[PDB]
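Problem 12. The chain below contains 132 residues. Write out its predicted structure in token notation.
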Amino acid sequence: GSSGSSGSESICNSLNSKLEPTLENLENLDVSAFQAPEDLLDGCRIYLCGFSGRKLDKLRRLINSGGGVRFNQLNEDVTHVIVGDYDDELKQFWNKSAHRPHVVGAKWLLECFSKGYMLSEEPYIHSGPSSG
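Solution.
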């Protein structure tokens, strides 16, 4: 006939505060973890470029979480440019308007929402490969 039984286990599954709020774990970054303020990036228009999968979905929840505004396009309003791999549009925008936005990696954004306050972008600048 039928007969069975269950037991106790300890598996890992998303729920509350899972994985560190680091890029390496962006797709599994609990943006809701960041105790940062809901106005972290008050009236801060940032331009997301590169991301697509969850990484982006995050920044979206982050920026918004911090009050920031996630622009679909680039412009002179852009106060920051969170790059993940490379920002092409940036080039175009540069060929359009004359401005120098802060190009950094989500990592920064995180740290910001991690420290609760905005941090330096210089220590989080996104440059190309090679050095010389």
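Discussion. The first helix runs from residue 54 to 65. Students who got a different answer should revisit the alignment rule from Section 12.3.
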